[PDB]
Write a protein that binds this ligand. Structure first.
Ligand SMILES: Cc1cc(CCCCCOc2ccc(C3=N[C@@H](C)CO3)cc2)on1
Ligand SMILES: Cc1cc(CCCCCOc2ccc(C3=N[C@@H](C)CO3)cc2)on1
Lengths: 236, 255, 273, 40, 273, 59, 59, 57, 40, 40
């Protein structure tokens, strides 16, 4: 008989501990694995695939239309859309990125925001996208917007433009749930010159917008998502 | 002078040419291949009809109009009646296959509109009734007709609400599945190569569909002034590397 | 590892930021393709986002309850909770369910922890000490009928006996019939016109049965069982869109009617911040 | 040290440290180079 | 090591005891610079004054309380202490607080011990055996609302279950967002005219939630939770003047008005012994 | 199963003992350290800095 | 005295676990084995012997 | 280990499927003696049917 | 590691991995070859 | 022997045995020698 002493914590059950256990089914042989395409190893692998952002959130019931950012022909100087960058809330929240970020407490890294244009091929347009780093207000006019991170996008044969929100930060991690100290800025978009439709054409054209994370990205300290809850256990 | 843009796919006794492609997607970066022995379980030698089943079948055409919500086809169902592919299907106990899907929609440089073409492995549909109402067989086996998401709820059928992918997930995130867009201004076809994806090496072709192909208008169709307000969309699909096993009497399936 | 390299002004014919999303790719664009950057290192590995880590902590998967009381004159033990069961399954409680259904097929060993606590809602002199016996009843094995049937002999069926207030812990290998469990199944069990649709017909694995071994004391004692499940040795294939609407049933994808808009409406314009 | 005979009884697995998003982010048939035109 | 060397009479032009304190230095003068000394050795290392040792013993950081009782008809569990929380923090109880605030920035892993004891202030037949479930609820995770919410499933959030009367112990890595925790912060969360001032806005880290898993017995049981915290792997920068006045608030430096003189007045003259 | 005997003191909590514990946050990666001037290692380092004495205590 | 911590599952009895136990009969010597024809090692050995099927179940 | 070997058409004078059960033997006939098979491996050892396992709980 | 002195006290035995059905499936005195006629 | 995988779970650290008061006691820009005049 070897002398032992038990410490504080004996008998506790910590849902996060990782130890060995007896197998209830001694000697059982599991089914062989066969090959299946698509294996995922890290959630970091999947948040780099871009998905659509319901940017046009202004509706009243969920609709395919809140994915469409409208553009008006012949407007000059004006603003196309605006949003803050609380990736865990608001427009971002239902996107795959938003949806995964919510399983973690802290995030750090660059984001990739792209816009794909869908107007007739014989039209043309020049837009400016601007990222405003924390510390200033959402820009109120392009002059204000153009003094921060921006890209003049020229609509052409190449249909999409990929803007990166480079990680601009004092503190090396931000909270995924919106927090002030930790806030990330604003994203706005304005006409640089203006949309022009060809003859025989009319109305609004739309941009689709996507979001995905750069390879830069870090997420840490897992927790429970506000995105799902329940009141009684389900049954069959 | 090769462009990403022009392409030719020859499979069996049938060929497709596109002069306005946008590359092609190969699901999960894997190309269809036959079933290796190391992965095999059933001891039966399989049948590989080759060129008589691995050719291109063009399903009947759809009509995109400003009110369209989107269409959904299931595989191998959509092909249950195409030539010898279909016969083999009803006659063997088990079968396995990959596909090349080519979705076509051309317009002019004055039109606008953008379709999402996506392949969803194991797309289990939801009942519009809620609770634990099931979706009857016939409803998930529309055949070449596919399911028309702008048709009405029916009884025992699935829900046809587009912002929810027919299953409780948001349209916006379908982009995590192999997919390609058809943006009239860019593109006129979409091509996806689908490798066989299952948790068993070979399965039944009639009780289980392993992918749904979905074509969904996202930026509404907008035709030039006084143009007819609609465009046809055509889907052509070719089984590839097909194998059938466990031949016998010929399945009888509901309806 | 560098998180960003140093990059300076650019005036090229080579534009990495113009792409064609119609192709289905997400081109790997970085901050340094469009602004001037400085070197910085990652200092991080992505350890805690590994799927083994993501699915590897215990989650509550089931709460049931049984009571110790005089069975004298009870015509239906099962019905008196003289013992209860659980037609086993993992999609019953939703926190863990949404996590698993981020994948289509999943393969793992399970580690179960079972906590049992007792309650004595009405006047008792004391708290008795009860031993629970949770037993696995696979498909085809004779389900028990009374709380003290021959079934409980469990001569061939693994069973664990632990005390109420304590915890039991054991681990079961991956018992799936195929190579993976599907989290999801667009099929039927056969081509029947009325057979049920979904994974419910696949994910068939028996049920687990609990009972108190003790005979009855003078008062009644409520014992409530909580089963926790931890995946170990995880393998996951084919990512899918996360669950947006609420769940209604074990094993079907169905969402409730007149549900509410899941996308938050702006308080303001598209232009609003 | 494993104290138990069966593999299911061992603790959690250890980090894939695999990580390759290209099956998801770039499943295109003809390779796309960043910087070269998307559609030629 | 010598504590003092031998030194004899001196009659020099080299005076080590005259200095200019205006410079900000404390010149390293020793007994042997001004008296005649003999050799002596230190016999000591200064082991127990290492900062790891100074901050490394468990200190009580929080006492809370929850009760097990029939929740039937309770409209606000939180309010009935059917479960309670703690918007986590270390500066709440002062013994450990004065110790930490001897430094400006501090970095360490935490080891928590949680002792839970039960009380039955009014007539009970017995002492029941309750299991506590303390769960970590980080910022953004859905706080629980009833004592038996879906929240308690805690499928992704670390939770520990232990018995009242026992102790639970686990250790959490340094969870700070920056490189160190500041013990102190002369800033705001943004340039707002009315935003709060201090570390309160920095030291934001979630809250910990406790509940009893047991349903109710016939009597009521008070369970009082004591959280102890031990720093391990300590790193401290920039020493500061020790706290002289009493504390009034978590996270602000504020002292009470009409406080009392903190320097003891002489009973006698400056000249007094 | 290896035979053991537990000694007096089992289960006690001594605020001054130093042992290992399971981490509640398995696999979490702490923020990198950056350099900060002023690190203190021993209280013996700081009690050698001189400070003023309120010698005139008579108020 | 070596410090220990007990985990969840301590004290449980799992009918399927396989561990060592003290022998109640220390030092006892079992009867020698003699040879007996017919040893079975696997149930897989015996299910390969064919047996009759009551196919005509209609009685 | 192979569970089934590959075997093709047969037109022989050597018939493994005709036997005389009166002898008391169970002749070791396999799928590949009477249909055309493909190779497959066992992937299994028969561990949990060992008599030690069967009587050991 | 055995902690106990007697052999009865050790854990379960380990798989025969013996397996030879012929004493049960082919106890015939003159050897029968599959494919050759049963009765000559 | 660490029984646990993570570094936070290890016991207390071990004595700096670093000790250098000069950052606090003599942060002067031009070095002062004891015995030499403070102000020259
Ligand atoms: C997807 C998906 C994943 C799962 C989980 C399947 C679990 C496998 C079977 O689980 C058990 C549970 C309990 C016992 C048991 N044995 C006794 C000692 C007590 O409980 C055995 C197997 O179900 N669907
Ligand atoms: C300065 C300074 C130092 C600190 C302490 C910060 C502590 C980090 C977060 O602490 C916890 C506490 C509890 C749990 C917990 N997990 C579950 C098993 C139970 O409790 C997790 C993290 O705060 N300000």
């Amino acid at each position: 008989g070897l002398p032992t002493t038990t410490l504080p914590g004996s008998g506790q059950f910590l849902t996060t501990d990782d130890r060995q256990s007896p197998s209830a089914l001694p000697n059982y042989e599991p089914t062989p694995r066969i090959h299946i395409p698509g294996k995922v190893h890290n959630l970091l692998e999947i948040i780099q695939v871009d998905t659509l952002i319901p940017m046009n959130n202004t509706h009243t019931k969920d609709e395919v239309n809140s994915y469409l950012i409208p553009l008006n022909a012949n407007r000059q100087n004006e603003q196309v859309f605006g949003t803050n960058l609380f990736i865990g809330d608001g427009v971002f929240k239902t996107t795959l990125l938003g949806e995964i970020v919510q399983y973690y407490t802290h995030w750090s890294g660059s984001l990739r925001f792209s816009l794909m244009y869908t107007g007739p091929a014989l039209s043309s347009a020049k837009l400016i996208l601007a990222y405003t780093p924390p510390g200033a207000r959402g820009p109120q006019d392009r002059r204000e917007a153009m003094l921060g991170t921006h890209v003049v996008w020229d609509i052409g044969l190449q249909s999409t433009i990929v803007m990166t929100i480079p990680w601009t930060s004092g503190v090396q991690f931000r909270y995924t749930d919106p927090d002030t100290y930790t806030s990330a800025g604003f994203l706005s978009c304005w006409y640089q010159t203006s949309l022009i439709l060809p003859p025989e054409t009319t109305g609004q054209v739309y941009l689709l917008s996507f979001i995905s994370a750069c390879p830069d990205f870090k997420l840490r300290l897992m927790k429970d998502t506000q995105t799902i809850s329940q009141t009684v256990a389900l049954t069959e | 002078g090769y462009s990403d843009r022009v392409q030719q796919i020859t499979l069996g006794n049938s060929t497709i040419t596109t002069q306005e492609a946008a590359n092609a997607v190969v699901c999960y970066a894997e190309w269809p291949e036959y079933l290796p022995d190391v992965d095999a379980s059933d001891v039966n030698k399989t049948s590989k009809p080759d060129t008589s089943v691995c050719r291109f079948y063009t399903l009947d055409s759809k009509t995109w109009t400003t009110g369209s919500k989107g269409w959904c086809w299931k595989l191998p169902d959509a092909l249950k009646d195409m030539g010898v592919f279909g016969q083999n299907m009803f006659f063997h106990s088990l079968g396995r296959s990959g596909y090349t899907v080519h979705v076509q929609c051309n317009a002019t440089k004055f039109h606008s509109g953008c379709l999402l073409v996506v392949v969803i492995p194991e797309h289990q549909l939801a009942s519009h009734e809620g609770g634990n109402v099931s979706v009857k067989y016939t409803f998930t086996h529309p055949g070449e007709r596919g399911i028309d998401l702008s048709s009405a709820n029916e009884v025992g059928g699935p829900v046809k609400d587009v912002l929810y992918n027919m299953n409780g997930t948001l349209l916006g995130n379908l982009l995590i599945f192999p997919h390609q867009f058809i943006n009239l201004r860019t593109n006129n076809t979409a091509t996806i190569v689908i490798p066989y994806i299952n948790s068993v090496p070979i399965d039944s072709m009639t009780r289980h569909n392993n992918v749904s192909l979905m074509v969904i208008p996202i930026a509404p169709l907008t035709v030039p002034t006084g143009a007819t307000p609609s465009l046809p969309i055509t889907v052509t699909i070719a089984p590839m590397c097909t194998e059938f096993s466990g031949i016998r009497s010929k399945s009888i399936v509901p309806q | 590892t560098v998180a960003s390299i140093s990059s300076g002004p650019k005036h090229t014919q080579k534009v990495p930021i113009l792409t064609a999303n119609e192709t289905g790719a997400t081109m790997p664009v970085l901050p340094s393709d469009s602004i001037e950057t400085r070197t910085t290192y990652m200092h991080f590995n992505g350890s805690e986002t590994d799927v083994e880590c993501f699915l590897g902590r215990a989650a509550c998967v089931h709460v049931t309850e049984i009571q110790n009381k005089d069975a004298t004159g009870i015509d239906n033990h099962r019905e008196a909770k003289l013992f209860n069961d659980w037609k086993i399954n993992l999609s019953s409680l939703v926190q863990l369910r949404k996590k698993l259904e981020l994948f289509t097929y999943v393969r793992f060993d399970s580690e179960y922890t079972i906590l049992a606590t007792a309650s004595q809602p009405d006047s008792a002199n004391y708290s008795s000490n009860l031993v629970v016996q949770a037993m696995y009843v696979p498909p085809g094995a004779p389900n028990p009928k009374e709380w003290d049937d021959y079934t409980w002999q469990s001569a061939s069926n693994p069973s664990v006996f632990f005390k109420v207030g304590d915890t039991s812990r054991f681990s079961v290998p991956y018992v799936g019939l195929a190579s993976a469990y599907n989290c999801f199944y667009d099929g039927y069990s056969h081509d029947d016109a009325e057979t049920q649709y979904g994974i419910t017909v696949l994910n068939h694995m028996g049920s687990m049965a609990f009972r108190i071994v003790n005979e009855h004391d003078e008062h009644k004692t409520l014992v409530k069982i909580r089963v926790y499940h931890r995946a170990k040795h995880v393998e996951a294939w084919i990512p899918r869109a996360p669950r947006a609407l609420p769940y209604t049933s074990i094993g079907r994808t169905n969402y409730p009617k007149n549900t509410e808009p899941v996308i938050k409406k702006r308080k303001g314009d598209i232009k609003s911040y | 040290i494993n104290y138990y005979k069966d593999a299911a009884s061992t603790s959690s697995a250890g980090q894939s440290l695999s990580m390759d998003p290209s099956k998801f982010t770039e499943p295109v048939k003809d390779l796309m180079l960043k910087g070269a035109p998307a559609l030629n």
